[PDB]
Design a protein around this ligand. Structure first.
Ligand SMILES: Nc1nc2c(ncn2[C@@H]2O[C@H](COP(=O)(O)OP(=O)(O)OP(=O)(O)O)[C@@H](O)[C@H]2O)c(=O)[nH]1
Ligand SMILES: Nc1nc2c(ncn2[C@@H]2O[C@H](COP(=O)(O)OP(=O)(O)O)[C@@H](O)[C@H]2O)c(=O)[nH]1
Ligand SMILES: Nc1nc2c(ncn2[C@@H]2O[C@H](COP(=O)(O)OP(=O)(O)O)[C@@H](O)[C@H]2O)c(=O)[nH]1
Ligand SMILES: [Mg+2]
Lengths: 427, 430, 214, 427
């Protein structure tokens, strides 16, 4: 009884959310009509984690959907799992996205915020217990970055105790899909640092790179890209859903991985990943799993760990397996590469094992880590922001909404201090 | 769901309007009578029975061009109220088309536009078509734009208008009218696109292999661009792009707004079999100066911001590789104070071909609208031509007699000079 | 080489073994191509499609894997042109051993022939002596003899074993099994190529089949 | 558990290595698909030396494929045993070979070296132990001579302890397949002397000669020539793979046959060999094998031993035979021909016996020796080098890559001292 509330915002959040709800529906074995048709009683033990039950044995997910324009909403309606979602949980506006952070936060944000909050209050107060919230949104856009952070602050006010774990999309450094991203990203960073307990950063360039290097897909579409992200959310909350030899929920993750309140940005990785034709040659076991997890190419964020150093890291293993072999790998990988860990924190690598692996895979693992290599990510957006801010023109679109120019100075100042915060702990 | 209203003024606007609406009907599958043998609500309204009615208004101060539609095949589709015709045209005079004859009909047309807006619950912007050289395109268009600005305020007013050609010209008084329309447009317009006939003639002769084009061929090429821009709102795609999204990224300043247009692939039926036309080929062709619909070389200037729209068999991964290869081109210039510069849109609905058309059936297509300082080359040419005629006062009496005070001539000259400064100080670097 | 082995045995000076110039000079440009897939328990490899190439000038087998998009497998030449010996017969492979529906063990891997190119089928038909599987007269005579022995009307067989009044390759095999005689998949395709009145020989018609049956 | 890593670089090495894997697969009874279909339990004892196990009951070989152009890999994919190789082990460039040592070492070598090493690291650290590496390359070429020596330097840095045994083909003195070999050979030797523990030299002309003399072949192909090379490949590692009366591995071979750090270049030979029609009449016994082994015509390298003197020699015997018979012959062959052995090292002949002979042969033997006759081989390349080094114009191709001319002077100086080194030890 550790119910988790799912919240989606914007274009990216829904399409990732739509693909995410397919996977856990498959793992528990939920028919698209909402009726249970699975294959094991273990699926019904703690189905309360993600799904609610109606009168007619028809499982409805704890999902809330938010957008400024209905274009994204209707695509979800026609999706394969479209009938599953609760009809009243769809909350949407009737105005263009605008791709403006100030417009999304202030003008249309306030109108939707009051209606959205009561929608969440329906789901929040309908469970015997409520562990935390889970947000999927984009930072380069205007609706997810703007309205999502507004909802994030309000959620903290009403429910301070609960874990506000979020999944975010980081703008690409080489070529990106929006000009005004450095404004939107920097402004959202200031809200995210103080409010959100746990933030996972995901970059599209790594996703394209992983598919080309490993899976050998010539034309990897968004369906493939969102699916790789879809594993990670399923893996993290799996400890709640299934038994194991060492349980580790979200609150365990934050305690171990967060040494200081402001250093909580994380990198994630998933294993095993193999080309469809290559799998026959592989000898998938625990030692092979550890090889991919600590390999820098499997990281889903374009921040090479070797350029920085690690502080904390946590790994989960799924599947019936010897506990000893898992524990030995944590020791060997830590002692072998001591140059990338801080001396003043021993035992930087957490381990946990869960009984039931996902479909098709005899055992799978999930990696979540925290490292100073994020200083590369924030330097890229800072250098672009200064070139943005010197040419004071794009501020025009933000001023008309009502944003004061001092906020841009404030947003960079806090984010600048975040950069040097990672710098000093390297010593 | 959400609606866009199209407004056409002048012979050119109505002529382009004819080509644009025939493409919409074929794409959506609507018979010319309004019946059928989705995104219909965006451009069309359901009359109650089987017929569909479009959201358009046709305006001209002379009946000939409007009466062609009234007697034409498409006459059943349109509402008689939407077809508004004056009595006598402006005779290539801005003063006549603004003060004396324009004000006879301005409030009549505005009622019909406002009446159409009542049915548009999700109206997000307007589309307006001009010919700068014509009297009605400039004089009447300025009066309509000024009214709509106060009538509706923060509603996007996007314009797609015909710029005078560098050397090809059909009206002597053309430099006078274009400058006068420049002053009214620059403050009120949210964003205005430029195309010129001289560039289209060369494109309609070289790439599309037709030796003897008419206005009819050029109008269909214009129609393709408008359909591509509105496709992201009409149909599904991996990356939806709205009018507001276009407005924010393309314009860096208030007065720099002017973008340019391009389209690819533009090819004949024969050459289609020889080329695969993947994402790499179409994107590379968009950047050559030959494909510009405005006859100005981008190499003279620099690029501020660009937008690409992809239709058909396009995978997002291949788009990033194509644009990344674009970035490696030393032949392309960008200002340092704008590193990203790109927004991409991918839509699944492929282009629609026309019976007796000029284009082959390409499975995928791409459209580009970009902001560049190269347009300052075009403004200088018009500025120099005007000065020679005004220095000897070659046509002032015609304008003054029709309500114009002569003080307007230096003021419209001054604002254009300020605008040329605006494009230059943007081109400066720090 | 093993050819040099025979030279060493025959003469104290191992004079070079002569290659069959008549066969090489005549049949230099003749190549038969066959489409085949693996018969293996691996689900991934079972879905891989291969094209087999047999050179008549020197009796070598070459296997190529066409590139497939989103397959994740490095396609290309799967086996070079090689002078391979048939494990079943203990003799070097010959063109007569290549039959549609016949499973061939190549590189001690198991391959099932699926389709053949238009020239390969036409060349096999043009020389019935070296390709008994394409000798239609033998098939027709055996079919007529079996029908006479069974005493079953061909019209009733057509009504019973045809789907939508058309006979498939499986349908023709079913008819042959009902009579009591075997038909190879190569023989059935030869029947379809010769008799079927369509551009692509995939089915037979009632009057056309009766002409073949009577 | 003494795993050996095999690496193939270039056009020459890949073709020989491909023929090499056919013999090893045949001896152990490994299917081209990788399944085991052998006939004895003894084959499964120590297959770990050369093979890894896959999940689906397949066996994957410890092989890494290296070349600058994709043409050589596609033929390997077309090879009879092509499926056996691991798909990810194929690392290749996208440029022409160039036949240039400087271009292979500097321009394309650095780019490939980083990618190749991590592929090697996968196999190197995936096994319980690793005794030595095994490289196949040519010296007259541009890819295997240039890049092969580069990887040889890096392998020594990471794995100093392991035996870096290599197999090389020497440019022929009468007629050869490349004009610029003496440049490529001279540069390679300087890297070869200091880095590699064991080097066996092979000459194509002798491989022609033995086929014409003994095997009586008037149309020998590269299949027969590579097959003869593959015999010595399996014989040396055979002691690790099978039991015997007297075991002798690589490190035993290096200790006995190498009296000084730089005198380690070796000549190899194999027995029995017979004209394939006369094999019936041969009374093949242990003394008969000894006659072939010390016969100069059977030597695989075109450097007549009689013109120099011997320092060390070693022979292996495969099969069940008498221990006294093997030991007696080495005493007789040493005393009968004392004029070709140094007085200051007695017992110049080392022996070994292996229980299981190769297929088809009741017993077989392998001979490896070191002698001063190598001074003939280095004289041929050195004398040619001086002639075209005066004509400094060929260097211009190597100059454009970035090679500095003193490297030619440095390399010849080392080779000249190596020639002098064998001169002084004759006394
Ligand atoms: N590209 C294009 N331009 C056109 C077309 N028709 C007219 N034009 C432009 O229109 C200009 C002539 O002015 P008009 O077409 O009469 O426009 P107007 O504002 O209505 O002028 P008036 O008739 O006096 O009211 C020419 O210079 C053309 O550039 C057309 O079909 N295609
Ligand atoms: N990987 C992935 N990225 C997406 C998807 N949809 C949108 N994005 C990314 O989200 C970013 C901003 O999108 P936007 O429309 O502004 O989202 P929103 O305004 O927050 O709703 C773009 O750079 C896209 O690359 C998707 O389905 N998959
Ligand atoms: N014995 C033998 N020699 C070969 C084979 N393939 C190539 N060679 C020889 O290798 C020499 C140099 O070839 P090259 O391609 O430049 O070798 P690499 O560049 O070092 O890989 C030539 O003299 C060839 O005769 C083979 O399969 N067997
Ligand atoms: Mg007019």
């Amino acid at each position: 009884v550790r119910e988790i509330v799912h919240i989606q915002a914007g274009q990216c959040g829904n399409q990732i959310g739509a693909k995410f709800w397919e996977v856990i529906s498959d793992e528990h074995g939920i028919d698209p009509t909402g009726s249970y048709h699975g294959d094991s009683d273990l699926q019904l033990e703690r189905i309360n984690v993600y799904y609610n039950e109606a009168t007619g044995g028809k499982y409805v997910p704890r999902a809330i959907l938010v957008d400024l324009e209905p274009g994204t909403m209707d695509s979800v309606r026609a999706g394969q799992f479209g009938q599953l979602f609760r009809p009243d949980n769809f909350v949407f506006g009737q105005s263009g996205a605008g791709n403006n952070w100030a417009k999304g936060y202030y003008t249309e944000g306030q109108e939707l915020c009051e209606s959205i909050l009561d929608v969440i209050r329906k789901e929040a107060e309908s469970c015997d217990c409520l562990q935390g919230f889970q947000l999927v949104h984009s930072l380069g856009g205007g609706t997810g970055a703007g309205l999502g952070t507004l909802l994030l602050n309000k959620l903290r006010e009403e429910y301070p105790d609960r874990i506000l774990s979020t999944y975010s999309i980081v703008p690409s450094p080489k070529v990106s899909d929006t000009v005004v991203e450095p404004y939107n990203c920097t402004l959202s960073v200031h809200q995210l640092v103080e409010s959100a307990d746990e933030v996972f950063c995901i970059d599209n360039e790594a996703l394209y790179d992983i598919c080309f290097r490993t899976l050998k897909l010539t034309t990897p579409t968004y369906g493939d890209l969102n699916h790789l992200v879809s594993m990670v959310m399923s893996g993290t909350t799996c400890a709640l859903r299934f038994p194991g030899q060492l349980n580790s929920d979200l609150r365990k993750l934050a305690v171990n991985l967060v040494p200081f309140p402001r250093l909580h940005f994380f990198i994630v990785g998933f294993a095993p990943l193999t080309s469809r034709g290559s799998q026959q040659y592989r000898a998938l076991t625990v030692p092979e799993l550890t090889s991919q997890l600590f390999d820098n190419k499997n990281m889903m964020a374009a921040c090479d760990p070797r350029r920085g150093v690690y502080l904390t890291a946590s790994a989960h293993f799924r599947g019936r397996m010897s506990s000893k072999e898992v524990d030995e790998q944590m020791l060997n990988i830590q002692a072998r590469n001591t140059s990338y860990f801080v001396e003043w924190i021993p035992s930087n690598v957490k381990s946990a094992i869960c009984d039931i692996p996902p479909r098709g895979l005899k055992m799978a693992a999930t990696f979540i880590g925290n490292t100073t290599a994020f200083r590369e990510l924030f330097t890229r957006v800072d250098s672009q922001f200064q070139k943005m801010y010197a040419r004071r023109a794009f501020i025009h679109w933000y001023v008309n909404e009502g944003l004061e120019t001092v906020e841009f100075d404030e947003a960079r100042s806090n984010m600048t201090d975040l950069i040097q915060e990672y710098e000093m702990y390297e010593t | 769901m959400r609606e866009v209203i199209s407004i056409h003024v002048g012979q050119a606007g109505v002529q382009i309007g004819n080509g644009c609406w025939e493409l919409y009907c074929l794409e959506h599958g609507i018979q010319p009578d309004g019946q059928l043998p989705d995104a219909f609500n965006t451009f069309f309204s359901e009359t109650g029975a089987g017929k569909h009615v479009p959201r358009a208004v046709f305006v001209d101060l002379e009946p000939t061009v409007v009466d062609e539609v009234r007697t034409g095949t498409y006459r059943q589709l349109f509402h008689p109220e939407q077809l508004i015709s004056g009595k006598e045209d402006a005779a290539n005079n801005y003063a006549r088309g603004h003060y004396t004859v324009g004000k006879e009909i301005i409030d009549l047309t505005l009622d019909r536009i406002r009446k159409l807006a009542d049915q548009c619950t999700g109206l997000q912007g307007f589309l307006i078509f001009h010919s700068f050289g014509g009297g009605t395109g400039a004089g009447f268009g300025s009066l309509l734009l000024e009214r709509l600005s106060v009538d509706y305020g923060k509603k996007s007013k996007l314009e797609f208008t015909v710029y005078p050609s560098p050397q090809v010209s059909t009206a002597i008084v053309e430099p006078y009218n274009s400058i006068l329309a420049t002053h009214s447009m620059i403050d009120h317009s949210d964003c205005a696109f430029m195309v010129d006939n001289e560039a289209l003639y060369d494109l309609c002769r070289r790439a599309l292999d037709i030796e003897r084009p008419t206005y009819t061929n050029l109008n269909r090429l214009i129609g393709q661009v408008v359909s591509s821009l509105t496709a992201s709102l009409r149909f599904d795609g991996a990356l939806n792009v709205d009018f507001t999204e276009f407005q924010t990224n393309l314009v860096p300043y208030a007065r720099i707004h002017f973008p340019i247009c391009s389209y690819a692939p533009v090819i004949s039926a024969e050459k289609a079999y020889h080329e695969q036309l993947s994402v790499a080929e179409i994107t590379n062709s968009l950047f050559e100066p030959a494909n510009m619909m405005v006859k100005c070389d981008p190499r003279h200037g620099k690029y501020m911001a660009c937008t690409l729209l992809y239709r058909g068999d396009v995978v997002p991964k291949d788009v990033s590789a194509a644009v990344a290869t674009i970035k490696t081109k030393r032949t392309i210039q960008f200002v340092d104070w704008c590193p990203t510069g790109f927004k991409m849109g991918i839509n699944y609905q492929p282009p629609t071909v026309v019976p007796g058309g000029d284009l082959a059936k390409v499975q995928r297509a791409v459209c580009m609208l970009a902001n560049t300082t190269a347009i300052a080359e075009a403004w200088s040419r018009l500025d120099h031509k005007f000065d020679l005629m005004y220095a000897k006062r070659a046509f002032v009496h015609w304008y003054v007699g029709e309500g114009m005070e002569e003080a307007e001539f230096p003021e419209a000259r001054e604002d254009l000079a300020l605008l040329e400064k605006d494009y230059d100080e943007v081109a400066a670097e720090s | 080489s093993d050819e040099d082995t025979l030279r060493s045995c025959i003469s104290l000076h191992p004079k070079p073994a002569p290659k069959d110039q008549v066969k090489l000079l005549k049949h230099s440009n003749d190549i038969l191509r066959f489409k085949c897939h693996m018969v293996t328990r691996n689900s991934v490899d079972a879905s891989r499609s291969f094209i087999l190439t047999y050179f008549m000038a020197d009796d070598t087998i070459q296997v190529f894997e066409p590139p497939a998009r989103n397959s994740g497998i490095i396609a290309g030449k799967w086996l070079q042109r090689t002078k391979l010996t048939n494990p079943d017969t203990g003799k070097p492979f010959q063109a007569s051993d290549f039959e549609i529906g016949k499973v061939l063990t190549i590189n001690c891997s198991k391959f099932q022939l699926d389709e053949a190119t238009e020239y390969a089928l036409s060349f096999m038909e043009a020389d019935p002596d070296s390709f008994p599987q394409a000798d239609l007269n033998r098939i027709v005579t055996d079919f007529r003899a079996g029908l006479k022995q069974s005493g079953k009307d061909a019209t009733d067989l057509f009504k019973k074993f045809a789907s939508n009044n058309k006979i498939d390759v499986k349908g023709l095999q079913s008819i042959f099994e009902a009579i009591g005689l075997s038909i190879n998949v190569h023989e059935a395709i030869t029947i379809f190529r010769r008799y079927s009145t369509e551009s692509k020989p995939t089915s037979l018609n009632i009057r056309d089949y009766l002409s073949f049956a009577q």
